[PDB]
Amino acid sequence: IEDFILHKMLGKGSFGKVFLAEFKKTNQFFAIKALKKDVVLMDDDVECTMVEKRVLSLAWEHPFLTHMFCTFQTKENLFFVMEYLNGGDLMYHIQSCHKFDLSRATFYAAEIILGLQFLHSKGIVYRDLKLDNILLDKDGHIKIADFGMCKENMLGDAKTNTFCGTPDYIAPEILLGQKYNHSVDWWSFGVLLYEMLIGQSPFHGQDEEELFHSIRMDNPFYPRWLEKEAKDLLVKLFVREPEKRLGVRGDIRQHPLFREINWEELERKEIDPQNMFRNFSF
Description:
CATH topology of the largest domain: Transferase(Phosphotransferase), domain 1
Number of strands: 7
Subcellular location: Cytoplasm; Cell membrane
Binding site for ATP: 10-18, 33
Family: Belongs to the protein kinase superfamily. AGC Ser/Thr protein kinase family. PKC subfamily.
Radius of gyration: 19 Å
Strand content: 15-25%
Active site: 128 (proton acceptor)
Protein name: Protein kinase C theta type
């Protein structure tokens, strides 16, 4: 770790803090996630750390997921050395820009879709899709980050039941206590897309209880200036019954909103914008 200069703290993710780090001998910068073994054991999230390592290794395969170069440990901390994406997170951009025009939001939404579908095809349910977790690379393309909450081996008819996720993005099926699958990511995606276009969250509440009631009963507000095909996509995403939700049912890529997108070219980026943790190193 002394081989790196920790210039600044980028933020705190699932677990551990993330720093902008320079590898002294090369001037190359990276984003390092640091975790204190001791609170990792107390919070008994040893496997949660293995999950992230695993998904980050998998992500190497996809252009819209954050990549990891290596992993190493000290006698008190765990470190994930990931690629540095200088564009910042989308939440930040939405806060300063208030909202994105339909074309820009559509472009990010499409790349997010491919990132999610890749994860799902690999038996993974992300469970933490939110603006805060979407970063922009220096080329203008996005990358999903923070995989500490993923659930693997979600293949075939496999379903899971842990209540989790950021409240604003929690799917209704989870709130109603049903065993669930990738359908929850498609709901969070809808919330995320709604936010990029409207600059506000679709479901409100003075507190979490009110928010949950809103997620379960209310219909989001759609401004008169919101394009019809965008409203239609959101409406199909905000279907309570998970088995009737676009993304779970049908082909979200064929929705009119994405009519001008060549998905294959998009993915090719041809469309411009005591011994608990042994062998952990990599």
